[PDB]
Amino acid sequence: AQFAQKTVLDEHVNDADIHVTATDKTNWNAKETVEGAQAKADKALADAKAFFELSSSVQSVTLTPKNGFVASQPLIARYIKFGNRFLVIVSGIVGKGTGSGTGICATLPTFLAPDASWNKLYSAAQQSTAASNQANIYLSVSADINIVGVGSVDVNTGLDGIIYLTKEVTT
Amino acid sequence: AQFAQKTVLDEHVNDADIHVTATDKTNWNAKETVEGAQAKADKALADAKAFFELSSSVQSVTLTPKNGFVASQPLIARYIKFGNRFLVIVSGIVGKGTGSGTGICATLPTFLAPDASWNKLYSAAQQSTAASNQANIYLSVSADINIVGVGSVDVNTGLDGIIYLTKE
Amino acid sequence: AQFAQKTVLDEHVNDADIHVTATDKTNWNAKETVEGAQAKADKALADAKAFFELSSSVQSVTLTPKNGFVASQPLIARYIKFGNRFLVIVSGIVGKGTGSGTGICATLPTFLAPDASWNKLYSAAQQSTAASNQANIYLSVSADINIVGVGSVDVNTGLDGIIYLTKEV
């Protein structure tokens, strides 16, 4: 019936506070959702778990017997990353073979060299029911496994007690 | 003169670009906030740290002495997960008890069997000031701890030096 | 006729559902972006990796020889956190020095005390070609390294095989 005042329409039309722009609505429609933010956080967690499993998995290398020794059991060094070092756990049993039963029976790779300034000394069992058949084994700074004393040169010697850490070297 | 033109009111009411809908406002009010996204990221970080602490925690089991041996100190196998295997660290001291002082003194759980194709060999101390009282221990592929030779059957034998990686 | 009806203007002006407020618009402009949420997730991943790498790094402490023994090679305990415990890996070689060749040659720090109710028993190599020159070592509950028996008191004794877990703390 009655007509609207131009002033009232004008004030409404010029009230920018109660209207929007087309570009505003595109901006707001594109904002992140709670489900999208949670998916990204879930993926960060999954990536973290995968990185941890990778970092903490056990690695292995096979060692070749030297100086006439034989690998009566396969000579295997297993190792685990801890920070920028490795924990190295040797395994296997060496036999006299054609050598003397003494001396260097195997050498580990250079990246498994021990953190040490001279030989490290290990007590090892020999494969024997006589408890006097044990060994004094040196692990050298270049990672030679050097059998220095044995109860008997004719009895096999175990390497399963040789465990050590490497130097602080980025990897 | 002072009245508003119908053409002007009509163009305004049909400018959908500058107006919204109830559905728009519900959608926009429900969008993620900066603190809400940060809370979710913070929770992911806390969950990662908790998962790491759990995955690297030590588990323990007290072992049953076998073949007449006694647990002069409790025989405990402690173990840590690494990837798809465990690092196992045995502890305790066995006494002769009603047995001979040699043979299988304990067997670890099957899932802690060593990664090996034959026995693993360990030198062990006995509980003695005589250094000839030591022991040769074989850890079998079925995780038997077999004291195969000792300096003296009448002296206790330690298990604290047995450490190894399992299979799988 | 050509003029706008006051009822139609009034109805539009009173339709709050199709209009907004200044506060609405600040609320929506402040909302998180896909890029911003992804940056926060990326930082959570980077922080997790940094925490893991630090947490699993090896720590070291040098031990002082006691009771007249000497350190022919430095006595160093290296240790790794595993949950609420530590794995301790001892290293070094002790000599008789001015002592007797037996007894407590070194004590580890209190926070590296072993999880044990009595001594833990270790066989150690001596620096000798005679395999009868080995040692029985007791690690006490107070973390004393006690050389209880040796084949020869005049030959050095290695500590490189002593590995153990601490208590839950």
Side-chain angles (χ1 to χ4, degrees), chain C residues 8-92:
Chain C
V8 176
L9 175 59
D10 278 4
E11 156 167 2
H12 180 80
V13 161
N14 290 294
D15 191 355
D17 278 358
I18 57 176
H19 296 98
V20 306
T21 69
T23 296
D24 284 336
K25 293 195 287 190
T26 299
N27 183 40
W28 301 331
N29 281 330
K31 296 288 188 170
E32 180 64 284
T33 67
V34 168
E35 295 80 11
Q38 185 64 68
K40 291 174 172 66
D42 287 350
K43 175 163 190 308
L45 174 59
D47 287 348
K49 290 178 176 172
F51 171 82
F52 164 72
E53 281 184 20
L54 184 60
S55 291
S56 70
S57 285
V58 174
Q59 313 290 302
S60 301
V61 57
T62 295
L63 308 183
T64 302
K66 297 167 77 152
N67 293 310
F69 285 93
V70 294
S72 89
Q73 290 294 306
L75 313 184
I76 301 170
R78 297 184 180 94
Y79 60 98
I80 304 165
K81 187 177 186 288
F82 285 106
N84 56 9
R85 298 169 187 264
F86 297 105
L87 180 70
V88 182
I89 302 172
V90 187
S91 69

Side-chain angles (χ1 to χ4, degrees), chain B residues 8 10 12 99 110 120 125 141:
Chain B
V8 177
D10 196 73
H12 178 75
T110 48
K120 296 170 67 69
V141 293

Side-chain angles (χ1 to χ4, degrees), chain B residues 59-135:
Chain B
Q59 320 286 302
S60 301
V61 58
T62 293
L63 306 181
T64 298
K66 296 171 79 152
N67 291 303
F69 286 97
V70 296
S72 179
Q73 299 298 314
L75 312 184
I76 301 172
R78 297 183 178 98
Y79 56 101
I80 305 169
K81 185 179 105 70
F82 289 108
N84 49 12
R85 52 178 102 208
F86 299 97
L87 181 71
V88 180
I89 301 175
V90 185
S91 70
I93 304 177
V94 296
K96 190 189 194 181
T98 60
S100 68
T102 61
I104 294 169
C105 66
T107 303
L108 290 109
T110 48
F111 63 84
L112 299 183
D115 191 0
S117 50
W118 198 74
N119 295 292
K120 296 170 67 69
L121 313 191
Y122 295 90
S123 157
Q126 299 193 274
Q127 189 182 320
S128 171
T129 55
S132 53
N133 287 336
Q134 301 197 319

Side-chain angles (χ1 to χ4, degrees), chain A:
Chain A
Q2 204 170 23
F3 299 133
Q5 296 294 309
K6 173 167 192 284
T7 71
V8 175
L9 173 60
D10 276 4
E11 163 164 2
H12 178 81
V13 161
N14 290 294
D15 189 352
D17 275 356
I18 60 178
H19 295 98
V20 305
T21 71
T23 49
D24 286 336
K25 297 202 289 192
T26 299
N27 182 35
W28 298 331
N29 285 333
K31 294 286 188 173
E32 178 66 285
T33 65
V34 293
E35 299 82 13
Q38 189 64 70
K40 293 177 176 69
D42 288 350
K43 177 161 190 308
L45 177 59
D47 289 353
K49 288 179 177 177
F51 170 82
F52 163 77
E53 267 266 4
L54 189 63
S55 296
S56 66
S57 293
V58 175
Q59 323 277 117
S60 77
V61 296
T62 293
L63 309 182
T64 301
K66 300 168 78 153
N67 292 309
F69 284 93
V70 296
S72 177
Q73 297 298 312
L75 308 183
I76 300 169
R78 298 182 179 92
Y79 58 98
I80 305 169
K81 183 180 184 287
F82 286 103
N84 286 303
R85 301 169 182 262
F86 302 104
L87 179 69
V88 177
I89 301 171
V90 184
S91 70
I93 301 174
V94 296
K96 186 190 196 177
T98 58
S100 61
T102 71
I104 293 170
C105 68
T107 304
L108 294 107
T110 62
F111 74 99
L112 296 184
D115 194 5
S117 49
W118 199 72
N119 297 297
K120 295 169 67 68
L121 277 41
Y122 293 88
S123 175
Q126 298 195 278
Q127 185 181 323
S128 169
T129 61
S132 57
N133 287 334
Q134 300 194 316
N136 291 329
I137 302 186
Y138 294 13
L139 179 66
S140 80
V141 296
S142 54
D144 303 299
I145 304 177
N146 184 5
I147 299 167
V148 163
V150 293
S152 164
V153 303
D154 298 314
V155 174
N156 296 347
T157 295
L159 304 185
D160 302 299
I162 300 171
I163 299 172
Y164 66 93
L165 290 160
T166 67
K167 294 180 125 65
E168 207 68 66
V169 178
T170 183
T171 180

Side-chain angles (χ1 to χ4, degrees), chain C residues 98-119:
Chain C
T98 60
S100 69
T102 64
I104 296 165
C105 65
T107 301
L108 293 124
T110 305
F111 71 98
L112 300 181
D115 195 4
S117 48
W118 197 70
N119 297 295

Side-chain angles (χ1 to χ4, degrees), chain B residues 11-77:
Chain B
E11 160 162 0
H12 178 75
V13 161
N14 283 288
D15 196 358
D17 279 355
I18 64 173
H19 293 96
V20 305
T21 69
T23 295
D24 285 334
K25 296 201 283 189
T26 296
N27 178 37
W28 298 330
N29 282 331
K31 293 285 187 169
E32 182 63 283
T33 66
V34 173
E35 293 179 343
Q38 187 61 68
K40 291 175 174 67
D42 288 349
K43 178 73 182 320
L45 175 59
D47 286 355
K49 294 182 176 174
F51 165 83
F52 162 74
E53 289 267 7
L54 193 64
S55 293
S56 64
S57 280
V58 177
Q59 320 286 302
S60 301
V61 58
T62 293
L63 306 181
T64 298
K66 296 171 79 152
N67 291 303
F69 286 97
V70 296
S72 179
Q73 299 298 314
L75 312 184
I76 301 172

